[PDB]
Write a protein that binds this ligand. Sequence first.
Ligand SMILES: C[C@@H]1CCO[C@H]2Cn3cc(C(=O)NCc4ccc(F)cc4F)c(=O)c(O)c3C(=O)N12
Ligand SMILES: C[C@@H]1CCO[C@H]2Cn3cc(C(=O)NCc4ccc(F)cc4F)c(=O)c(O)c3C(=O)N12
Ligand SMILES: [Cl-]
Ligand SMILES: [Cl-]
Ligand SMILES: [Mg+2]
Ligand SMILES: [Mg+2]
Ligand SMILES: [Mg+2]
Ligand SMILES: [Mg+2]
Ligand SMILES: [Zn+2]
Ligand SMILES: [Zn+2]
Ligand SMILES: [Zn+2]
Ligand SMILES: [Zn+2]
Lengths: 32, 47, 270, 270, 69, 31, 252
Amino acid sequence: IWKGEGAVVIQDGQDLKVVPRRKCKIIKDYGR
Amino acid sequence: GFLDGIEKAQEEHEKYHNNWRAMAEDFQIPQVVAKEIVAQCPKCQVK
Amino acid sequence: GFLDGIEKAQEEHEKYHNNWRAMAEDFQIPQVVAKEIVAQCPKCQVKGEAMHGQVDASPKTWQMDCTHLEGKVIIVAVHVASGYIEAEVLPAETGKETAHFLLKLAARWPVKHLHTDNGDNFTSSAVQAVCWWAQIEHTFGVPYNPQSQGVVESMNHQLKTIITQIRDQAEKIETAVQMAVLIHNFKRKGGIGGYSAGERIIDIIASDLQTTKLQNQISKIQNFRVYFREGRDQQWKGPATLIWKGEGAVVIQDGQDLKVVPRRKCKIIK
Amino acid sequence: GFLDGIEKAQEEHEKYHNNWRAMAEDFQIPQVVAKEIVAQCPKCQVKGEAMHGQVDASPKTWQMDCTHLEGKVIIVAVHVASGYIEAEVLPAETGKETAHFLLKLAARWPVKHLHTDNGDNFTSSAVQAVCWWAQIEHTFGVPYNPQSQGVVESMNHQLKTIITQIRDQAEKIETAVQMAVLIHNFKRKGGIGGYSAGERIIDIIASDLQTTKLQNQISKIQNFRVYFREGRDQQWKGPATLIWKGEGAVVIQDGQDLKVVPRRKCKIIK
Amino acid sequence: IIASDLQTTKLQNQISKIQNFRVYFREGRDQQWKGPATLIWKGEGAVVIQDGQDLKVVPRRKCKIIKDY
Amino acid sequence: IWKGEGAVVIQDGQDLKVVPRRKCKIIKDYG
Amino acid sequence: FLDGIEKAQEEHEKYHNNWRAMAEDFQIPQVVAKEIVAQCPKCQSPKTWQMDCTHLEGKVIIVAVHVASGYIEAEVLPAETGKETAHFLLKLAARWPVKHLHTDNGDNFTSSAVQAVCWWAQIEHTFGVVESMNHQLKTIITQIRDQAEKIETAVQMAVLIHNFKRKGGIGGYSAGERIIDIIASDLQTTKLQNQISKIQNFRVYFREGRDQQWKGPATLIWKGEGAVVIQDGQDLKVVPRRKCKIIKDYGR
DNA sequence: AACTGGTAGAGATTTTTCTTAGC
DNA sequence: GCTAAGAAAAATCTCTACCA
DNA sequence: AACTGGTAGAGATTTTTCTTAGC
DNA sequence: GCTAAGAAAAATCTCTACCA
Ligand SMILES: C[C@@H]1CCO[C@H]2Cn3cc(C(=O)NCc4ccc(F)cc4F)c(=O)c(O)c3C(=O)N12
Ligand SMILES: C[C@@H]1CCO[C@H]2Cn3cc(C(=O)NCc4ccc(F)cc4F)c(=O)c(O)c3C(=O)N12
Ligand SMILES: [Cl-]
Ligand SMILES: [Cl-]
Ligand SMILES: [Mg+2]
Ligand SMILES: [Mg+2]
Ligand SMILES: [Mg+2]
Ligand SMILES: [Mg+2]
Ligand SMILES: [Zn+2]
Ligand SMILES: [Zn+2]
Ligand SMILES: [Zn+2]
Ligand SMILES: [Zn+2]
């Protein structure tokens, strides 16, 4: 949802959560 | 141009279900539109 | 996806003739596809490429043009490497007076290359016969492109400003033209070496003659053949003449071509 | 010495009109004397100073001009800070149609300053009466200097290229003019913010209104008077309003003038 | 028979992707933009174009060269 | 360094290079 | 360096060389060798032209010859009045540096128009090679006459053949190489003279070795990076820069 | 397939030179 | 006696109009 | 004493992003 | 699992014609 400098906001299971960037891997998604 | 290449690549993936690097090298279209042609098919997965 | 966006963008450019940023923002297609949609249109594509060239500046190149002043016809010739002006007043703009002016100029100074525009007097049989008899290479510019002969039109501007400066000291216009030629050639300094135009043309031609005689006397008694190794493939080429051996690279002459080879890929044989 | 050189250089410039480097090299006088000899001559001094100005770009300034295309008369008005074009086809070039076009434009958009050239239709009693009734400040350019209204002549060039692009889709020339206005205003992007002209004029006017209302609400409840010490002499001036206190400098308002004072030369009194 | 056809098609593809250009130029007294042509020689300053079996020399400041992707 | 027929070898800032003949002016520059 | 100056002074004392040869041989700069020549008591034109008129097949030709090289400029006049001779002199003075003109005591050369042209162009006119040049030009004109229709084309073709195609003399050069070399040598001399006066507007106080007194004001000749050449008492000497003080001298 | 913009002057800014006060 | 501040004078860099 | 050149596109060059081989 | 090479794609900088 939002990619910050040190924080990352994700949506999962109708829930929003904030994970720091050193525990996350961002990939592209071709899921049309 | 390669707009007719995009049309022929859509027909070719509709028949034979190629991958994206093969269509990008054969029809001389860029890699983004070839990956999108693979992505909009429900049976194939880009890898 | 954006394939329907590509089809709608093609119909949108067919009606409205957008640029690529409008299509890439409104239809969310990548910029390479939008640039291709614009680049495959014939009603677009109206723009140059924004660069300038560089004219010939050999030590024996002259440029010629004609101009009008107070109902007269002036003909101007300029030596390009120095800025040296010869000018005359013609009674008419035919080809016979142009051939006569070219013959006088070729009888005074060494001319080997002449550059002109495509006027009716420069493209004539009389000028062609004079160029054949005096062995001059005549070249023409691209039609309706006055930037090819930039030096002679710039000297037209300078000559007209000088003529307006010293106009009240003469009765006729031919006297004022010759006084303007003298004032330009010998009474204005500044440029490459702080010279005037007469000192610069003397320096250029004398230096050319002296350096040809010096390198003839040097190269007639040479030695030290050099075999070098160059190219994409590690091959070996024929005998070349060593010219100058310096700290870092060597200068060789092969097939009347000058090359600079590093010191690691060459071998000297006496 | 060189005093006889100075006298001979004055007579030489009186006859030949040298530049200063020729006299400073031939007569061995210093360069300040040669520059003075050239600078005290009236037949010389023909050159500008090689700089450009910058036109007004207030958020309510408009510029207007007329042009010709296929035997018709187009009148173009441009909003300067955004690039927004209104254009019409006039049956004649009199002052009544220009006053009517100006009245329609002033009835649509907020106009407070108008800039034009010195044509026969813009300098008229009808345009003066419309400007008086609608409270518009009308200014004119320096005569025979088209660079003062640079934006409207540039938009004349862009409008003519668009009209040549979409010419075969219309029957008359008025339809082609209005289609070119639509294509320019809404189908071309790129510029300051990546906007088109319509999005940019909306953004500019809305931002101006919002920032006036915000700073009115801020400045109606302010406090913290500030006495500062500035000038060439260490004097003291009257009460000024503190606006913003930052690390390094403070911003004060005194006599409806904004100033930036360093933090050492000011004192805050509640 | 098939392998030599593969080598011939690869070499023809390279030769076809060398010099497939189009040129939109501007020439004449009334300097209007004209249709496509074929580029022959490209020097620094001017280009030589083939158009309607006519050879023309246009400066690079008055022409636009479209390549292929 | 050397003046050929269609090329000129010059040394500039201890760097040797080859320029065409139509892009050079060779003088002695008394001054 | 100092050995080079001593060898150059002894060589000039024996053989009286010129300054270009000494500067090339003994590897001293040009201003020092020019001062060595300028101090010798036993050692103390490129802009002179001659004009004449002639007749050929009913036409009036006018010939101007640069004397020191043999360089010919010719023209065909419509008449023999003073205004056409003044126009030819103005064109000649506008193309080449003319400083001293030599003519005969004809009618058209003694005229108010020619005197006004000489006044405006600053030429010294003197009334008395050209007959030999007229003879040689008429031989070339009768040699290539069948290749032209009019007489002006034949005159200009003979001028071209004489200037650039006939070689002779000591080195085997034509007339154009001779006139260009002569004028270039004169230009080099004038530039060196300007540098000489601009350097010699100074003065030097120098301190000898094993002494704390400053010596007399010697005239500066060459100011190097680490050496200074001065003239004092008709003697040239080289002092290093850390024992010298250079001041201006207003001693006109 | 082998062609092409340039010249000179006005100010602004950086570097060199020349005189003099101070320790 | 030596050195640094300060001002004058010379050198260099950027930008414009006009040439049919 | 209160006036003034600008807009958009074509290439060249530098920066960011995306896929894959190798340890 | 992690990292660096390499290539595609997007962003920025410099320069030109035309506006009576
Ligand atoms: C009939 C001949 C042959 C066919 O072309 C015409 C018209 N022409 C026009 C200009 C001209 O427009 N000069 C101004 C100018 C403008 C821009 C620039 F970059 C350089 C410039 F000199 C000339 O100088 C010129 O000589 C001619 C000419 O001779 N002719
Ligand atoms: C009779 C009115 C009032 C008196 O002046 C004339 C002539 N004029 C001439 C141009 C013109 O030359 N435009 C080309 C152009 C050239 C250079 C530049 F920097 C900008 C440019 F637009 C105009 O645009 C224009 O409007 C007028 C005009 O209106 N008039
Ligand atoms: Cl032309
Ligand atoms: Cl005006
Ligand atoms: Mg012409
Ligand atoms: Mg011309
Ligand atoms: Mg107008
Ligand atoms: Mg206008
Ligand atoms: Zn599929
Ligand atoms: Zn289009
Ligand atoms: Zn003057
Ligand atoms: Zn002697």
